[PDB]
Design a protein around this motif. Structure first.
Motif, PDB file in Angstrom:
ATOM      1  N   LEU A   1       0.822  -1.207   0.000  1.00  0.00           N
ATOM      2  CA  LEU A   1       0.000   0.000   0.000  1.00  0.00           C
ATOM      3  C   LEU A   1       0.857   1.259   0.000  1.00  0.00           C
ATOM      4  CD1 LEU A   1      -2.982  -0.946   2.320  1.00  0.00           C
ATOM      5  CD2 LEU A   1      -2.424  -1.641  -0.015  1.00  0.00           C
ATOM      6  N   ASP A   2       1.948   1.263   0.764  1.00  0.00           N
ATOM      7  CA  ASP A   2       2.865   2.394   0.762  1.00  0.00           C
ATOM      8  C   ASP A   2       4.294   1.913   0.555  1.00  0.00           C
ATOM      9  OD1 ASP A   2       2.611   1.068   3.122  1.00  0.00           O
ATOM     10  OD2 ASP A   2       2.201   2.845   4.347  1.00  0.00           O
ATOM     11  N   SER A   3       5.262   2.812   0.705  1.00  0.00           N
ATOM     12  CA  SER A   3       6.667   2.478   0.528  1.00  0.00           C
ATOM     13  C   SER A   3       7.447   2.896   1.763  1.00  0.00           C
ATOM     14  CB  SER A   3       7.246   3.154  -0.718  1.00  0.00           C
ATOM     15  OG  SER A   3       7.595   4.501  -0.451  1.00  0.00           O
TER      16      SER A   3
ATOM     17  N   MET B   1      10.304   7.093  -4.229  1.00  0.00           N
ATOM     18  CA  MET B   1       9.402   6.117  -4.821  1.00  0.00           C
ATOM     19  C   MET B   1      10.198   4.893  -5.247  1.00  0.00           C
ATOM     20  SD  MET B   1       7.538   6.424  -8.522  1.00  0.00           S
ATOM     21  CE  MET B   1       9.096   7.106  -9.075  1.00  0.00           C
ATOM     22  N   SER B   2       9.693   3.719  -4.881  1.00  0.00           N
ATOM     23  CA  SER B   2      10.364   2.454  -5.136  1.00  0.00           C
ATOM     24  C   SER B   2       9.777   1.782  -6.370  1.00  0.00           C
ATOM     25  CB  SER B   2      10.243   1.522  -3.930  1.00  0.00           C
ATOM     26  OG  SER B   2      10.829   2.101  -2.778  1.00  0.00           O
ATOM     27  N   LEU B   3      10.632   1.080  -7.109  1.00  0.00           N
ATOM     28  CA  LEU B   3      10.240   0.419  -8.343  1.00  0.00           C
ATOM     29  C   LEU B   3      11.174  -0.756  -8.591  1.00  0.00           C
ATOM     30  CD1 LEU B   3      11.329   2.432 -11.523  1.00  0.00           C
ATOM     31  CD2 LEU B   3      12.671   2.116  -9.455  1.00  0.00           C
ATOM     32  N   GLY B   4      10.757  -1.638  -9.494  1.00  0.00           N
ATOM     33  CA  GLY B   4      11.570  -2.784  -9.847  1.00  0.00           C
ATOM     34  C   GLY B   4      11.307  -3.297 -11.246  1.00  0.00           C
ATOM     35  N   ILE B   5      11.936  -4.409 -11.601  1.00  0.00           N
ATOM     36  CA  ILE B   5      11.764  -5.017 -12.913  1.00  0.00           C
ATOM     37  C   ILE B   5      10.553  -5.936 -12.872  1.00  0.00           C
ATOM     38  CG2 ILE B   5      12.767  -6.586 -14.595  1.00  0.00           C
ATOM     39  CD1 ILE B   5      15.546  -5.461 -13.415  1.00  0.00           C
ATOM     40  N   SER B   6       9.607  -5.707 -13.777  1.00  0.00           N
ATOM     41  CA  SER B   6       8.381  -6.481 -13.852  1.00  0.00           C
ATOM     42  C   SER B   6       8.080  -6.802 -15.311  1.00  0.00           C
ATOM     43  CB  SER B   6       7.213  -5.732 -13.203  1.00  0.00           C
ATOM     44  OG  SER B   6       6.018  -6.482 -13.310  1.00  0.00           O
TER      45      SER B   6
ATOM     46  N   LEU C   1       3.271  11.959  -1.115  1.00  0.00           N
ATOM     47  CA  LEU C   1       3.891  11.324  -2.275  1.00  0.00           C
ATOM     48  C   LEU C   1       2.987  10.270  -2.903  1.00  0.00           C
ATOM     49  CD1 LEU C   1       7.692  10.972  -1.617  1.00  0.00           C
ATOM     50  CD2 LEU C   1       6.399  12.640  -2.935  1.00  0.00           C
ATOM     51  N   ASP C   2       2.329   9.449  -2.084  1.00  0.00           N
ATOM     52  CA  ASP C   2       1.389   8.475  -2.626  1.00  0.00           C
ATOM     53  C   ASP C   2       0.219   9.169  -3.308  1.00  0.00           C
ATOM     54  OD1 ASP C   2       2.408   5.712  -1.704  1.00  0.00           O
ATOM     55  OD2 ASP C   2       2.457   6.880   0.154  1.00  0.00           O
TER      56      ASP C   2
END
Lengths: 89, 50, 127, 49, 50
Positions: free
Chosen positions: A7-9, B23-28, E39-40
């Motif tokens: 839901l969040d980070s 903000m977090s992200l990855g390989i999808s 941020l969200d």
């Protein structure tokens, strides 16, 4: 089971005292560790490696009628043999 | 100051300073949205299992 | 000088070994954070001694008395030289100590719990 | 066929119209309604806009 | 469509030049924004709402 997305980070980070000589090289070390991929290895190693873990109707939905049919067949056979034995005697 | 989707890497940390990731992200994996497949020839037997 | 590594007990992050009682030193502990700290120590070439936080708390300011508790308090008051534990990065902890780049990203997620009768063909009609 | 026909529900409210997409909806090119849709903060009117 | 979870973990951060006085205030501002939930809101607005 976990279902869905986060839901969040947030995150977990290495904590050091204010104004310490250990901050910059521990940060370089953790980034180098993440880029080297060993961090993912640790995650998989103790989350999964040391872990301990249709639409059509199935037969179980209609097994009762099969049992009833076979029971009726058996009872009919029993009746037929009873009648045969009685008539023969 | 650089305010844009910049990936935090070891070399960039070696040269510049990065704040904590906003903000977090990855390989999808991206695949085409599924569509209704053409029914099989013997699809009338589908309601009952083999 | 050896570096004290202050940690909170939490699985899988750190655990007690089955044979922890007979063993001594850092070998008493095994977990995620001890392996992470081993990698950090190998990178920086320093000996480290593992110690569990006395109060067993993550850390939260008490507004009445303004004294840090937990590993953040241990770091601020000089009891610890570095903390390697599942410590969330927040504002209150950030203004008092230095957080490294997050090694494990996480977030709030949902956890849910994951055979018909033999005479189930009679359900459509009441008994 | 009959079950699907019974299941369909005519749009009787704003969010029923908004979440659905099959039937379009419009507003005047320049008017107070257009301004309300633009300078709105509620989620439903936001995604409508 | 997107299928499955994220293969790896990465983040996007704000970059600041080495030895500058903006790094720490920008960093604490980023954490305060993340903890507050702005941020969200921005991500939902610019990805899903729009």
């Amino acid at each position: 089971m976990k279902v869905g997305g986060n839901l969040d980070s947030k995150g977990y980070d290495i904590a050091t005292p204010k104004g310490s000589s250990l901050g910059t090289p521990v940060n370089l070390a953790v980034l180098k560790l993440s880029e080297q991929g060993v961090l993912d290895k640790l995650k998989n190693k103790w989350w999964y490696d040391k872990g301990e873990c249709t639409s059509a109707l199935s037969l179980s939905n209609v097994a009762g009628v099969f049992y009833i049919l076979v029971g009726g067949l058996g009872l009919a056979m029993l009746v037929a043999l009873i009648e045969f034995c009685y008539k023969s005697r | 100051i650089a305010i844009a989707p910049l990936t935090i890497t070891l070399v960039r940390e070696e040269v510049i300073d990065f704040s904590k990731p906003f903000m977090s992200l990855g390989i999808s994996i991206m695949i085409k949205k599924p569509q209704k497949s053409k029914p099989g020839v013997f699809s009338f037997l589908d309601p009952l299992a083999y | 000088k050896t570096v004290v590594v202050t940690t909170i007990l939490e699985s899988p992050y750190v655990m007690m070994k089955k044979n922890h009682e007979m063993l001594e030193g850092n070998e008493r502990y095994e977990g995620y954070c001890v392996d992470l700290a081993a990698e950090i120590a190998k990178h920086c070439g320093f000996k480290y001694k593992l110690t569990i936080v006395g109060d067993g708390k993550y850390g939260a300011r008490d507004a009445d008395t303004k004294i840090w508790n937990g590993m953040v308090g241990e770091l601020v008051y000089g009891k610890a030289d570095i903390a390697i534990a599942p410590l969330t990065i927040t504002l209150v902890r950030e203004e008092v100590i230095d957080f490294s780049k997050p090694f494990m990203s996480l977030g709030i997620s949902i956890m849910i719990k994951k055979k018909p009768g033999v005479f189930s063909f009679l359900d459509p009609l009441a008994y | 066929f009959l079950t699907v026909e019974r299941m369909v529900s005519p749009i009787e409210s704003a969010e029923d119209l908004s979440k659905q997409t099959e039937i379009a909806y419009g507003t005047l090119d320049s008017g107070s309604t257009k301004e309300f849709f633009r300078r709105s903060k509620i989620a439903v009117f936001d995604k409508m806009w």
